[PDB]
Amino acid sequence: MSAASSIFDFEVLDADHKPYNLVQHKGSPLLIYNVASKCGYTKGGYETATTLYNKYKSQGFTVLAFPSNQFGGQEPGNEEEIKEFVCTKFKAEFPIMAKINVNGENAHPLYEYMKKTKPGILATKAIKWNFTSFLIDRDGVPVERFSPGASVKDIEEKLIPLL
Numbered sequence: 001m002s003a004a005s006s007i008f009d010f011e012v013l014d015a016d017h018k019p020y021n022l023v024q025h026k027g028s029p030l031l032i033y034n035v036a037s038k039c040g041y042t043k044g045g046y047e048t049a050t051t052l053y054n055k056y057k058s059q060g061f062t063v064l065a066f067p068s069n070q071f072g073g074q075e076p077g078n079e080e081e082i083k084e085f086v087c088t089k090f091k092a093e094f095p096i097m098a099k100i101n102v103n104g105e106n107a108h109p110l111y112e113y114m115k116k117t118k119p120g121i122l123a124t125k126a127i128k129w130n131f132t133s134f135l136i137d138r139d140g141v142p143v144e145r146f147s148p149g150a151s152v153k154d155i156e157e158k159l160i161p162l163l
Contacts, residue, residue, distance in 0.1 A: 006140030028060030045131025
């Protein structure tokens with residue numbers, strides 16, 4: 001990890017567990033969200049990610065979603081939410097990757113890299129919320145961490161210069 005210098009140093013499998021060509025996105029910025037099953041609420045994160053995706057994908061931009069495998073008690077969000085309520089399969093217009101741990105001992109190394117690069121300002125570098133995102137520059141470097149209730153305008157302040 002000491003030689004990591006961009007997200008493109010990391011292994012990603014798509015939702016069918018095939019190797020995903022992440023470097024295809026190099027040269028243009030992107031937003032990487034962690035997601036989870038649809039229970040009814042995302043703090044605006046679904047709307048924000050979809051809006052930015054559809055607005056800017058023509059300029060080369062993409063949004064990628066990593067769903068949590070919910071394993072181990074320490075994944076983002078409330079662990080009793082999927083126990084208490086019906087939540088269905090996450091669906092979106094943008095790419096969704098295979099399920100991963102984003103916190104804990106088996107945290108995916110891409111997440112360990114983005115979290116330590118941009119630890120955020122609240123509490124520790126752990127991902128606390130579903131629909132947290134990282135803004136990635138043209139070189140694959142994480143340059144901002146956003147909470148899920150970040151507005152389109154707040155993210156645009158950072159993203160438009162990258163475009």
